Swiss-Prot record, chains A, B:
Residue span relative to the full protein: 89 to 746 of 888
Gene field: RNR1
Activity regulation text: Under complex allosteric control mediated by deoxynucleoside triphosphates and ATP binding to separate specificity and activation sites on the R1 subunit. The type of nucleotide bound at the specificity site determines substrate preference. It seems probable that ATP makes the enzyme reduce CDP and UDP, dGTP favors ADP reduction and dTTP favors GDP reduction. Stimulated by ATP and inhibited by dATP binding to the activity site. Inhibited by SML1.
Protein name as annotated: Ribonucleoside-diphosphate reductase large chain 1
Catalysis: reaction(s): a 2'-deoxyribonucleoside 5'-diphosphate + [thioredoxin]-disulfide + H2O = a ribonucleoside 5'-diphosphate + [thioredoxin]-dithiol
Assigned protein family: Belongs to the ribonucleoside diphosphate reductase large chain family.
Something else known: Two distinct regulatory sites have been defined: the specificity site, which controls substrate specificity, and the activity site which regulates overall catalytic activity. A substrate-binding catalytic site, located on R1, is formed only in the presence of the second subunit R2.
Originating species: Saccharomyces cerevisiae (strain ATCC 204508 / S288c) (Baker's yeast)
Length: 643, 643
């Protein structure tokens, strides 16, 4: 069904011709083709085809349906071919690095994000997952320039975070007409329609003092007038601390059109508060009860899972990019926290480490341990990969090229945190899981900064490194005013960074891993399992245990189907198992938030913290938000899932 | 209720401040303000306020509701003030010309189009009614650049004609993806949505060999899937002669994607036919029965009044702009026929002559005659006005400035043709009406070319005059291979044009006059009355006659209400009256088309020929189209009205 020889497969993909039009349509770049032909024997003999069976049925089907390159509707690539295409696409002439990446990916130590898997080694290799776009100007020309830019980015793969704080609100004056602005909603409908035309995937960012806020937060509601909804876009709130204070005090909140109150989004913290309370005192806006807004926000979150919540002041106070300017948005999945401006669209290239790969029974007596030294080594590899992607990437718009080449941010993440705890017999809410969580993120952050510092000794630091927190020896945990756990030597690293610089302004942004975790067969990313039963497949670790204890029968299976993936209150199942295989609906969200806060001291950017509320009340949701906020989180909430 | 002194009114408008924001919002330009202050006594004393009563109730209300400038929701301008503001807005420092235009407009000899009436004398004086826009390129970038340009033009006043022949059709290949084009309809929905956002008014032009044609023609249907309709846009067909021949032969017709059949819209006539039949023979497209398309077109016209029909080869063969390139569209109302390209958006400034103004009882014995010499003199005035507008206009986009300054087209038109015939006791379908129609259009065309030639002796000819038909002594009627009626001396004019040039590439484009004819109180533009009764106002001329004959009673009035504006088959009304006051539903469309064809030999551009079909059949509509087509018409049909 598929040619075996890799160079033979490369040849077919490269020579490919669209029969219907007679147009040659190479699916491999000149570059990678010439590389493969000059090295065919080394390359062909390196692939271990046994490794195609490291995938599950649903992992293979995921690859088959979307990832493996097709010739005339037929799969042309084997999984091993996809992986070697990616390796060369990243590494180019560096055959050695390519070979190392081939071996580590093929053994499932790590993977790159979907767009890298799609486009690495191909003629327009757009490998970035994330674009953060500034609304160019409060004008028809700026709106339409911004729209063109989103269209062109959406032509390729990857999401958009778009901030729109600078657009004048409903009823605002326009110079040259007697008519007024119709505000955000009509303009959002324009963007919605472009998202649909160019083959969703836009998040919109707004600060809650904007006067169109009440409609903005309701944009995904499945009822009401069809011309007030924008159903393919996601609203995200970019929330100042002052809003949270006014809500908690049960105080007032003032809504402005940005034309009546200029500059509010171009400052944060104390400067924001001073500027805000001054405009408030000067009668420039419309005052409400803060809790009236607060309540409408919880209503929309309860109904639609949105708006997302990202804390503006936490993002800005604790960003290594703070020498660039004020950060005005996150991205589609709320992990990326990078500077953007009309001339600079922040981009990011993504990869995730497979956490269970580092478990070894290695020891005396059948206990599993965690190999942190190997985690550290693989994270260095991935860091070097992501840095290469930056240089070999095709940028859809010039604003993205200019941003990426200047600041060189990258984003490492994880999958299989849940599997890891499960394999080590650690309940997600245990003291041992809490510790392992901190140690894992300490080592990945240590490793990435070390790799990046080595790159800066080879190539120079990134352009804007001088003046950064990192240039002053201030690493992420220091900006949380915490000492690191200290499994790695931070003083020596900080010494080296201050002397040599780093090659990347940012390194860590744990992402959802929605498709890539399915390819590898692990749970997802720092999140607990959502059920133990996802045509019905039972949690392999749970299955193993129930068989070993000799309790697994049809009576067991039904009790799992019927309680949808929960094993609690199953009569004859040991407590150790119930503790180990708690669903995310069964774990306290204060625990989830605690662990998010623990790991966040080692996270440069942010992370996509989904929240899961069993029996949701306004009161429970409020206390979750205020708890995350006071913990110092950047991303208070990504999606709210309920039921 | 209104200040009397004009300079006092100018002062208020100029000093105006938006109270709600504290922004100064002048409603008069620096230029006109400084002009008015330096000439206040001459200016104030020239206005004759008696003349505000030359308007009807519904004419005044038209002015009041939309035209007269407002200060804080209150009318600040008197009709005489609006007219003098317009006069200075056109003429500037030329106080004499201003005064002449004031007198002629205030006495209702002529008027300018709405945007001139809105914006003349104001800070952003966008006075043009018509923009013809080329789709920039078959790419996401070109589509979105075009969209931005339409948005910016629509911010101001005036319609868009947009040609889209160059966009690849549904299912076409895209290089760099496995997916295909979704064609025109999705892209049309993008434009529809922008039209709604920026405060309809777009016509779309397509040649009927495009493979998306069947959906394109159905875009205004009031049923079917909401995502195949574009309800605020108007489809217009840009029809090659070959299509009409294939339909009449009951032959085949081939549909192409422009990417499979390049160049089809960049040629016409014989070159088009040769290129087309070659692509047809080479299997590059999909063949159908021509009459299958023909039938779907009549169905859409019957249901929706659209698509408009404009004959591509007639427009190109008979255009003075033919040295520029191939013309690919008309405009929103199908009167403008001008060259457009990605870097040149054709524009046009419009004015209409009030035809009844030139009727004088002057004579021996109470007969009315028509003063052609005075018509000729007023048309020269209007021609000079329109040329000044070109230079004092604020262009919304650079593409429009570049086109207008190069070719300098203008568009004179008419209103009150119906009133004129009625006042002279000439039935619309009579031999005398047929003659007067030809003589009126002969004099307006003679007058405009004479004024324009005088301008070229003062300022030089327009930039692209060399190589034009007019430069070779070929005037419009010559391109119809007809001798002029000869009430004016054409040889001397043609001699002068060949020697001196003309200042304007085009001069005549009779337009709908939808609002301006209401302001003046006349019927419309070369069209018969649609009824004799339009809160119920009876045709003043008919009323006068029925009173004079002593037959006008409540029994008369009811018979008019009840037959909706028709006097035919009213028992006791003289035949002379029935002949004189035929409704447009009562006049043969072969007569309408004959008169359109007669006048067209003196029309540089085209004219907005609405058609009215009483009891419509596929057969009647077909023969109307083929009759106009064979007559050599450019605009075969604007709207189809029925019932
Ligand atoms: N015709 C329109 N329809 C809808 N919104 C408009 C329109 N014109 C302007 N706006 C909105 O008002 C804002 C200003 O648009 P812009 O193109 O800068 O107008 P302008 O003529 O320059 N007047 P101003 O910006 O007040 O000096 C943007 O947020 C637009 O979306
Ligand atoms: N992602 C998309 N969604 C919808 N239409 C598209 C998309 N990409 C291209 N098109 C359409 O296909 C045409 C070509 O678009 P363009 O941006 O030039 O694509 P391209 O990548 O340059 N490929 P090609 O034009 O075939 O060389 C235009 O008519 C577009 O509307
Ligand atoms: N449906 C999606 C999911 C993610 N993304 C982008 O990809 C990034 C990472 O999401 P992910 O980890 O779920 O993506 P995969 O690489 O696993 O497909 C996000 O931050 C988005 O910018 C997208 O464009 N569309
Ligand atoms: N509703 C309309 C009508 C006309 N127009 C433009 O104005 C031109 C002349 O139409 P018209 O003679 O009915 O306009 P008025 O000047 O009488 O308002 C058309 O060719 C269009 O380009 C428009 O933009 N919107
Ligand atoms: Mg502006
Ligand atoms: Mg292209």
């Amino acid at each position: 069904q598929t040619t075996k020889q890799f160079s033979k497969v490369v040849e077919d993909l490269y020579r490919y011709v669209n029969a219907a039009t007679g147009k040659p349509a190479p699916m491999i770049s000149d570059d990678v083709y010439n590389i493969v032909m000059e090295n065919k024997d080394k390359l062909n003999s390196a692939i271990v085809y046994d490794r195609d069976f490291q995938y599950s049925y649903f992992g293979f089907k995921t690859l088959e349906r979307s990832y493996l390159l097709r010739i005339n509707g037929q799969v042309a690539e084997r999984p091993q071919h996809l992986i070697m295409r990616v390796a060369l696409g990243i590494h180019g002439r560096d055959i050695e690095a390519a070979l190392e990446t081939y071996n580590l990916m093929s053994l499932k130590y790590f993977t790159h994000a979907s767009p890298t898997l799609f486009n690495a080694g191909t003629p327009k290799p757009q490998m970035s997952s994330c674009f953060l776009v500034a609304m160019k100007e409060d004008s028809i020309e700026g709106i339409y320039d911004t729209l063109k830019e989103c269209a062109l980015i959406s032509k390729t793969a990857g999401g958009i975070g778009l901030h729109i704080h600078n657009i004048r609100s409903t009823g605002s004056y326009i110079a040259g007409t007697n008519g007024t602005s119709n505000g955000l909603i009509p303009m959002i409908r324009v963007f919605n329609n472009t998202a649909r035309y160019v083959d969703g995937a836009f998040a919109l960012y707004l600060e809650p003092w904007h006067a169109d806020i009440f409609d903005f937060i309701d944009i995904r509601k499945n009822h009401g007038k069809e011309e007030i909804r924008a159903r393919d876009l996601f609203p995200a709130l970019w929330i100042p601390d002052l809003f949270m204070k006014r809500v908690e005090e049960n105080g007032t909140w003032t809504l402005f059109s940005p034309t009546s109150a200029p500059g509010l989004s171009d400052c944060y913290g104390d400067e924001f508060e001073a500027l805000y309370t001054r405009y408030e005192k000067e009668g420039r806006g419309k005052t409400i009860k803060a809790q009236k807004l607060w309540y409408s926000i919880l209503e929309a979150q309860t109904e639609t899972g949105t708006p997302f919540v990202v804390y503006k002041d936490a993002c800005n106070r604790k960003s290594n990019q703070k020498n660039l300017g004020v950060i005005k948005s996150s991205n589609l999945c709320c992990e990326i926290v990078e500077y953007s401006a009309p001339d600079e669209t922040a981009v990011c290239n993504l990869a995730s480490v497979a956490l269970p790969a580092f478990i070894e029974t290695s020891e005396d007596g059948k206990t599993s341990t965690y190999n942190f030294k190997k985690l550290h080594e693989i994270a260095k590899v991935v860091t070097r990969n992501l840095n290469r992607v930056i240089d070999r990437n095709y940028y859809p718009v010039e604003e993205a090229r200019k941003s990426n080449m200047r600041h060189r941010p990258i984003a490492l993440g994880v999958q299989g945190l849940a599997d890891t705890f499960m394999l080590l017999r650690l309940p997600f809410d245990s003291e041992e899981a809490r510790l392992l969580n901190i140690q894992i993120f300490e080592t990945i952050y240590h490793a990435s900064m070390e790799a990046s510092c080595e790159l800066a000794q080879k190539d120079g630091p990134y352009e804007t490194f001088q003046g950064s927190p990192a240039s002053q020896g201030i690493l992420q945990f220091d900006m949380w005013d915490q000492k690191p756990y200290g499994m790695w030597d931070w003083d020596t690293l900080r010494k080296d960074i201050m002397k040599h610089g780093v090659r990347n302004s940012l390194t860590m942004a744990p992402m959802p891993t929605a498709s890539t975790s399915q390819i590898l067969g692990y749970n997802e990313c720092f999140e607990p399992v959502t059920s133990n039963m996802y045509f019905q497949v039972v949690n392999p670790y749970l299955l193993r245990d129930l068989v070993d204890l000799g309790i697994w029968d049809e009576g067991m299976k039904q009790y799992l189907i019927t309680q949808n993936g929960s094993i609690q209150g199953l009569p004859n199942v040991p407590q150790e198992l119930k503790d180990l295989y708690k669903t995310v609906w069964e774990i306290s969200q204060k625990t989830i938030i605690n662990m998010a806060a623990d790991r966040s001291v080692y996270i440069d950017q942010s992370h996509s913290l989904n929240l899961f509320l069993r029996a949701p009340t306004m009161g429970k949701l409020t206390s979750m938000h205020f708890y995350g906020w006071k913990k110092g989180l950047k991303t208070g909430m990504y999606y709210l899932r309920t039921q």
